[PDB]
RNA sequence: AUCGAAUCGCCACCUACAAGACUGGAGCUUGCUCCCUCGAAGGCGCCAAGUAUAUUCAUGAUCACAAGACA
RNA sequence: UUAGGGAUAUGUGGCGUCAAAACUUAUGGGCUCAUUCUCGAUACGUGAAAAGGGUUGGUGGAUUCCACCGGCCCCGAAAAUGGAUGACGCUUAAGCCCAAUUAGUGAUUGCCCAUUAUUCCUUUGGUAAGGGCGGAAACAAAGGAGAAAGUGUAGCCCUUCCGAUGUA
RNA sequence: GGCCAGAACCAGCCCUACUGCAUUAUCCUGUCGGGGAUCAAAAUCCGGCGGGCAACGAAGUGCAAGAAGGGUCUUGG
């Protein structure tokens, strides 16, 4: 399945006024499900960093950054999440993916699973493709050995939806009730 | 056991010996709840179902977890009069029938008809052995339903530890059934082999265009 | 191209003359026949499906009760003009096997022409056998997934 | 429940696409009464006279994702004693 | 072990979805769930991600490196002759036959019915011959064992006279 | 003997069995190679007792429970 | 949020059976084992703390171990009729967090349920809105009939729009 | 026939089938240098430079303005 988050670059600024005639222009990476969310997150960052509210700002550009060609890579995701008990926790995790949006979506599912952290409490600081020799965790490093091979065991190969049956003769494929 | 009127009327009618459309399910290594749900839905759809080998149904978890579950169920009883209380059945086929009954609208006539369409056996009794090829329920089989690292229980063992007293009888009867069936299968190997060789030579005896037709549809 | 015109027809293109059809209802349900024409004013189809092969006589049938298959016999040499609506028009009763000689002769002529036309096609023996076969829905068959 | 619409499960029809194929087809529920009453072709074909009776309807639309179909019966709702009993789905009106 | 490992170069068949029953080569392993699949000789099989639940590992493995170039993949696949060997197997023929059955017309189904029925009839003929020679059918072996006894004790005088009288009566 | 019914796939080849972390067989290098029965069909049945030189079907008239059912 | 009826589509809530819906969806990622109190699936709300310890996550140091911080599970956790995630059951979940809509294919509506929404038909009432009402000309039996200047009736007749629940 | 049923057409609704415009660069390709790893490689990665359309149904990114098969016992003819 394709990643649920897209890679956005939102470019905006405070509206020029008499007190700020040539306001600074800010570039903001963010991984979001749609561009409305991406711009919402951009304005949150503008507010909490530059003290610029959305009601006094401009969106110069909001564009999806396309993913590169799909290659089995190692991804360093620098990510932070907030919880009431522990405040902000920042971690740097490694992931096997084929795109940056894939690695980031995987990181979000991972933080949701192992830390019960939801999307809006998560900030991604940096995602970066790294070489194999700079990979630190053995659970990621095992996957780039030259002779990597494994069988597929304990698999549940369900039939195609059209050919699925309720009752089947014990040692045949003869469907009885379907 | 038919009445004398039923036999006399059938004798008058000249009709042959009839058997309704019945599906026979081999429940060995089937997940108890999933098989029960599938069977219940098919019974509400009007199917006539006989299930065999209920003593080899499976439940996830260790045997002690599920025996303790059964004992918890067993202590439920109407204090002021245990007759008319919940009736706790110990036999595995009875357990499956109860599991299916709890998955039916048992207090309507429709649910009652559905429940009375189901026959449950331990082992495979002689009246069922020869009625036709038995079926499985793929979405309710242990080898695709349970991760094999997990412990699981066989229903007959739990039942015999909670009061079922027919475990050894069913074991001996199943051994005899398998021995008789395997003798009858080793014999008739020559008949099956004769039919296989007959089809192989029929290929060389039929017209050629028909052979090509079989080839393109994957039969030759 | 006039709706009032007898030539008006909205019949689906697969029910072309000469196409072999599966009869879905009526006396000859499951018999494969041959579509010869459609009667004027967007009327029913007429099928012979030569009575020698399957027993279907010259009969009219609504196209909502056939499966017109993609297998066809070229019947351009059959002369379906004498098959008319008046052929099946019947002078009814009043205060109340058997075939009129005209109907019998028309059956003979159409049937001879159709049998020759069928025998003139490649895999024509196979097509005669196909016209002799009976269609039935068997246990386990999914006709909604089939091509025809 | 709303009895004006019946749900029918057809053998070998296990996707919404198959049920789509069956949309518009004629549907029949065959049963018997106690007495012999009037049938179609009562005078023309007296061998049709029977306690047997049929109730007719049409498939209106699929139901769910797994091949179930909604059926509207002519004039009146199908009787609830038909629940769990056989239903005929014919191949006409045909589109092929 | 006889199980075909997931590895770089392994041929796979797509189990379900838009590419069901197509063949591709594993060119990279992402993680425990995902591999990169390409087959240069199938036009719908450009390099793409397949989940490992959706592939059948085959018994062939061209010899390529991970994240190999397209040219190396094509040259190795052509030299290894994996597609040819796979096509000569019966499961590939079964996939082809399923494809032909799916597209079959009514006349094609009738032709197949005729061919199967002709085969069945001819197998019946061969079986009847061999059954006459050496009995394995129920009726034939019953006939043999009851024939030994029928000819053992029909030579009786009363039996022969009764048989003659019955032949005369009819 | 009421009695008209609803039901629409047969089988003396499925109607034995076990395993799914190992499925026909080998080998040693233990996941690859070599062999085979090449690993994704229970057998029939669907209108000539079998694939062809055939042979009765109507008027039951265009849908109606198949107007018939020991395959 | 409500005239009484159909169709279509939703809301909240759901989609293993009960029970309509994934006939147990995916060609989605993780996590979790629990023995007489039953682990979990309990918005409101209807079963808990201080404190502590299996598994798999994080941070910071030392050479695999040291400390610290999360997730899920476990202990802490005792009441009186037999009993309650609603029941059965579920553990390649039918549990928890996250995310999809037939799936790295080629684009942005899977499905099921309302007295809601849209639309069609009928009723009834308006702070209702418009037309027609000077008989149009002719016309017997072996095209018919009606046409009232009107609050209210079987409402003069036609068209149109909107509302319609309710204790005292 | 003012009753039951089936097909045709019509009008109105309701489902189809068919998709163009803009955008991509944190991208695509060649070659130098490094860096990597094993028996040696290639690759994952980083900087340059020369070229560029990743164009299969390119991409699941923004907006789509594509007239006319099947449903109506969900309407009236
Ligand atoms: K609806
Ligand atoms: K009014
Ligand atoms: Mg006791
Ligand atoms: Mg009948
Ligand atoms: Mg349901
Ligand atoms: Mg599921
Ligand atoms: Mg509940
Ligand atoms: Mg109104
Ligand atoms: Mg009121
Ligand atoms: Na309310
Ligand atoms: Na999962």
As for chain D, the residues directly before each break of C–N over 2.5 Å are none
From the list E85, E78, E30, E90, the residue with the least C-alpha distance to E55 is E30
D73 vs D89: CA distance, rounded Å = 12
DSSP at A159: P
The two structure tokens encoding residue B69? 């579950």
Give A95 Cα–ligand 2 centroid separation in angstroms.
Answer: 72
Count other C-beta atoms under 10 Å from residue E38's C-beta: 19
Distance, CA of E167 to C1' of G2, in Å: 95
Best C144, C145, C147, C148 residue to mutate vs chain D (most D CBs within 10 Å): C144
E169 vs A177: CA distance, rounded Å = 57
E strand intervals along chain D: 6-8, 26-32, 52-63, 68-73, 88-89
C-alpha dihedral sign at E57, E62, E64, E67: negative
From the list B140, B151, B141, B56, the residue with the least C-alpha distance to B95 is B56
Q: Do C67 and D94 touch (CB under 8 A)?
A: yes
User: Which burial class, exposed, middle or buried, applies to A128 when counting CB atoms under 10 A from its CB (0-12, 13-18, 19+)?
Assistant: exposed
Largest CA distance in chain B: 83
From the list A102, A97, A105, the residue with the least C-alpha distance to A122 is A105
Q: Are A29 and A123 in contact (CB under 8 A)?
A: no
Q: D30 forms bridges with which residues in the sheet?
A: D54
Q: Distance from CA of residue E132 to its chain's centroid?
A: 31
Assess whether the previous peptide bond of D93 is cis (omega < 30° from 0).
Answer: yes
Contacts of B28 (CB under 8 A, 6+ apart): B53, B56, B57
Distance, CA of E36 to C1' of G104, in Å: 10
**Positions in chain H where some atom is under 7 Å from a protein CB:** 4-10, 23-29, 35-38, 41-46, 54, 56-57, 59-62, 69-74
Q: Which ligand is nearest to the CA of D5?
A: 1
DSSP at B217: T
D12 vs E151: CA distance, rounded Å = 56
C45 vs C66: CA distance, rounded Å = 9
Contacts of E39 (CB under 8 A, 6+ apart): E22, E23, E24, E25, E45, E77
The two structure tokens encoding residue A145? 């050995």
Residue A122, CB, less than 7 Å from strand G? Answer: no
From the list B135, E35, E141, the residue with the least C-alpha distance to A169 is B135
HSE-up (13 A, CA, CB side) for residue E47: 17
The two structure tokens encoding residue B52? 């065999």
Q: Do E111 and C126 touch (CB under 8 A)?
A: yes
Q: Name which of A154, A156, A168 is nearest B136 (Cβ-Cβ).
A: A168
Q: Are D69 and D87 in contact (CB under 8 A)?
A: no
The two structure tokens encoding residue A34? 């749609």
CA C67 → CA A55, C20, C147, distances in Å? Answer: 67, 8, 11
Q: Which ligand is nearest to the CA of A113?
A: 11
CA B74 → CA B39, B56, B57, B120, distances in Å? Answer: 25, 21, 20, 21
The b/e string for B63-99 (b: 16+ C-beta within 10 A; e otherwise) is eeebbeebeeeeeeeeeeeeeeeeebebbbbbbbbbb
C73 vs C33: CA distance, rounded Å = 11
E-chain CB neighbours of B184 within 8 Å are none
Residue A2, CB, less than 7 Å from strand H? Answer: yes
Residue by residue, DSSP assigns B88-120 as: ---SHHHHHHHHHHTTS-TTSHHHHHHHHTEEE
For C110-115, the CB contacts below 8 A with 24+ separation are C110/C36, C110/C48, C110/C58, C110/C78, C110/C80, C110/C83, C111/C48, C111/C50, C111/C51, C111/C52, C113/C75, C113/C77, C113/C78, C113/C79, C114/C34, C114/C36, C114/C48, C114/C50, C114/C73, C114/C75, C114/C78, C115/C50, C115/C52
Q: Are E16 and A160 in contact (CB under 8 A)?
A: yes
B218 vs B197: CA distance, rounded Å = 18
Technique employed here was cryo-EM
Q: Are E12 and E26 in contact (CB under 8 A)?
A: yes
Q: Which ligand is nearest to the CA of D52?
A: 4
As for chain C, the residues directly before each break of C–N over 2.5 Å are 96
Is the CB of D20 inside 8 Å of chain A's CB atoms? no
Helix (H, G, I), strand (E, B) or coil at B201: helix
Enumerate the H helices of A48-147 as residue ranges. 100-115, 138-141
E83 vs E62: CA distance, rounded Å = 10
From the list E16, E61, A9, E106, the residue with the least C-alpha distance to C130 is E106
Q: A87 forms bridges with which residues in the sheet?
A: A83
For tokens 């570039």, what's the residue?
A: A27
C114 vs C36: CA distance, rounded Å = 9
D-chain CB neighbours of C143 within 8 Å are 91
Q: D27 forms bridges with which residues in the sheet?
A: D57, D89
Residue B146, CB, less than 7 Å from strand G? Answer: yes
For tokens 């000469």, what's the residue?
A: C18
Distance, CA of A89 to C1' of G49, in Å: 26
Helix (H, G, I), strand (E, B) or coil at D21: helix
Known binding residue C31? Answer is no
Q: Are D11 and D48 in contact (CB under 8 A)?
A: no
B61 vs E3: CA distance, rounded Å = 30
Is the CB of C13 inside 8 Å of chain A's CB atoms? no
What is the DSSP pairing of strand A26-32 with strand A6-14? antiparallel
D26 vs D88: CA distance, rounded Å = 8
From the list B195, D12, C128, the residue with the least C-alpha distance to E114 is C128
For tokens 């293109």, what's the residue?
A: C13
Residue by residue, DSSP assigns B122-183 as: SS--HHHHTSS--EE-GGGBHHHHS-TTS-EEEHHHHHHHTT---HHHHHHHHHHHHHHHHH
The two structure tokens encoding residue B56? 């080899």
What is the DSSP pairing of strand C66-72 with strand D68-73? unpaired
E161 vs E155: CA distance, rounded Å = 10
Phi (first) and psi of residue D69, to 5 degrees: -130, 145
Residue A148, CB, less than 7 Å from strand H? Answer: no
E45 vs E52: CA distance, rounded Å = 16
Nearest-Å Rg of the Cα atoms of chain A is: 23
Q: Do D9 and B44 touch (CB under 8 A)?
A: no
Residue B30, CB, less than 7 Å from strand F? Answer: no
Q: Are E119 and B208 in contact (CB under 8 A)?
A: no
Q: Are E60 and E80 in contact (CB under 8 A)?
A: yes
Phi (first) and psi of residue B128, to 5 degrees: -100, -25
From the list B10, B53, B58, B67, the residue with the least C-alpha distance to B178 is B53
The two structure tokens encoding residue B199? 């089809």
Strand order in A6-14's β-sheet?
A26-32, A6-14, A57-64
User: Which burial class, exposed, middle or buried, applies to C100 when counting CB atoms under 10 A from its CB (0-12, 13-18, 19+)?
Assistant: exposed
From the list E16, B61, E13, B148, the residue with the least C-alpha distance to A154 is B148
B-chain CB neighbours of A169 within 8 Å are 133-136
Strand order in A122-130's β-sheet?
A87-97, A73-83, A122-130
C61 vs A176: CA distance, rounded Å = 36
Contacts of B12 (CB under 8 A, 6+ apart): none
What is the DSSP pairing of strand B22-26 with strand B48-52? parallel
CA distance to partner chain E, nearest, from residue B186 (Å): 13
Q: Do A97 and E30 touch (CB under 8 A)?
A: yes
Q: What angle is formed at CA A36 by the lines to CA A33 and CA A38, rounded to 5 degrees? A: 60
Is the CB of D93 inside 8 Å of chain C's CB atoms? yes
Q: Distance from CA of residue B56 to its chain's centroid?
A: 10
B188 vs B194: CA distance, rounded Å = 10
The two structure tokens encoding residue A178? 């379907």
What is the DSSP pairing of strand B152-154 with strand B58-60? antiparallel
E35 vs A72: CA distance, rounded Å = 8
């Amino acid at each position: 399945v394709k990643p649920h988050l897209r890679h956005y670059q939102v470019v905006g600024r405070e509206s020029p006024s008499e007190k700020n005639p040539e306001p600074t222009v800010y570039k903001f990476e963010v991984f979001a499900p749609n561009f409305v969310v991406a711009k919402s997150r951009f304005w949150r960052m503008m507010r909490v960093k530059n003290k610029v509210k959305a009601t006094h700002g401009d969106v110069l550009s909001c564009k999806v950054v396309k993913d590169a060609k799909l290659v089995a890579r190692n991804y360093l995701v620098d990510i932070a999440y907030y919880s009431q008990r522990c405040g902000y926790t920042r971690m740097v995790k490694e992931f096997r993916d084929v795109s940056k949006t894939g690695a980031v979506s995987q990181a979000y599912h991972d933080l949701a699973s192992r830390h019960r952290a939801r999307y809006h409490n998560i900030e991604v600081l940096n995602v970066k493709s790294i070489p194999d020799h700079e990979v630190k965790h053995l659970s990621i490093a095992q996957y780039h050995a030259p002779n990597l091979s494994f069988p597929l065991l304990q698999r549940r190969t369900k039939a195609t939806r059209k050919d699925r049956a309720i009752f089947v003769k014990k040692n045949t494929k003869r469907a009885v009730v379907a | 056991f038919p009445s004398r009127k039923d036999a006399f009327r059938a004798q008058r009618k000249g009709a042959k010996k009839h058997r309704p459309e019945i599906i026979v399910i081999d429940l060995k290594d089937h997940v108890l709840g999933r098989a029960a749900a599938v069977v219940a839905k098919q019974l509400l759809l009007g199917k006539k179902i006989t299930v065999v080998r209920c003593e080899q149904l499976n439940i996830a978890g260790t045997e002690i977890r599920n025996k303790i579950k059964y004992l918890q169920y067993l202590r439920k009883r109407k204090l002021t009069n245990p007759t008319k209380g919940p009736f706790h059945h110990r036999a595995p086929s009875d357990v499956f029938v109860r599991t299916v009954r709890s998955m039916l609208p048992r207090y309507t006539k429709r649910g009652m008809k559905a429940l009375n369409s189901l026959v449950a056996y331990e082992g495979i009794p002689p009246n069922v052995v020869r009625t036709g090829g038995r079926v499985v329920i793929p979405r309710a089989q242990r080898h695709v339903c349970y991760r094999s690292e997990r412990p699981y229980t066989v229903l007959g063992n739990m039942c015999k530890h909670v009061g079922w007293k027919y475990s050894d009888v069913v074991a001996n009867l199943e051994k005899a059934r398998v021995e008789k069936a395997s003798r009858h299968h080793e014999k008739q190997a020559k008949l099956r082999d004769a039919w296989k060789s007959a089809r192989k030579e029929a290929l060389a005896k039929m017209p050629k265009h028909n052979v090509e037709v079989l080839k393109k549809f994957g039969y030759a | 191209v006039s709706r009032k015109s007898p030539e008006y027809t909205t019949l689906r293109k697969s029910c072309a003359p000469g196409a072999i059809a599966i009869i879905l209802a009526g006396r000859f349900r499951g018999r494969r026949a041959v579509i010869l024409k459609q009667l004027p004013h967007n009327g029913p189809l007429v099928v012979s499906g030569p009575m020698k092969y399957n027993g279907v006589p010259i009969r009219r049938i609504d196209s909502r009760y056939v499966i017109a298959t993609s297998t066809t016999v070229d019947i351009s040499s059959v002369d379906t003009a004498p098959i008319t609506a008046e052929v099946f028009q019947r002078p009814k009763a009043e205060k109340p096997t058997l075939v009129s000689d005209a109907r019998a002769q028309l059956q003979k002529k159409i049937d001879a022409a159709l049998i020759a036309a069928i025998k003139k096609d490649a895999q024509g023996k196979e097509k005669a056998g196909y016209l002799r076969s009976v269609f039935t829905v068997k246990p386990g068959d999914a006709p909604h997934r089939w091509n025809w | 429940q709303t009895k004006q619409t019946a749900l029918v499960r057809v053998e070998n029809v296990n996707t919404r696409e198959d049920a789509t194929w069956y949309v518009g087809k004629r549907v029949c529920y065959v049963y018997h009464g106690k007495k012999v009453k009037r049938c179609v072709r009562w005078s023309k074909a007296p061998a049709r006279r029977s306690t047997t009776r049929a109730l007719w309807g049409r498939v209106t639309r699929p139901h769910g994702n797994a091949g179930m179909m909604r059926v509207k019966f002519n004039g009146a709702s199908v009787p609830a004693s038909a629940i769990g009993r056989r239903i005929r789905v014919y191949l006409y009106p045909s589109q092929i | 072990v006889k199980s075909h490992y997931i590895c770089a170069g392994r041929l796979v068949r797509i189990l379900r979805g838009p590419r069901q029953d197509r063949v591709g080569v594993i060119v990279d392993i992402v993680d425990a769930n995902r591999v990169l699949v390409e087959n240069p000789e199938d036009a719908k099989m450009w390099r793409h991600v397949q989940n490992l639940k959706n592939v059948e590992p085959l018994k062939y493995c061209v010899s390529v490196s991970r994240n190999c170039s397209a040219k190396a993949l094509k040259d190795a696949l052509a030299s290894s002759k994996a597609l040819e060997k796979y096509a000569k197997t019966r499961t590939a023929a079964r996939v082809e036959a399923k494809k032909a059955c799916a597209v079959s017309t009514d006349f094609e189904r009738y032709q197949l019915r005729v061919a199967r029925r002709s085969r069945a009839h001819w197998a019946r003929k061969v079986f009847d011959e061999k059954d006459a020679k050496t009995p394995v059918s129920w009726h034939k072996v019953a006939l043999k064992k009851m024939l030994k006894k029928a000819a053992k004790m029909d030579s009786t005088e009363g039996a022969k006279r009764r048989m003659q009288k019955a032949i005369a009566a009819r």
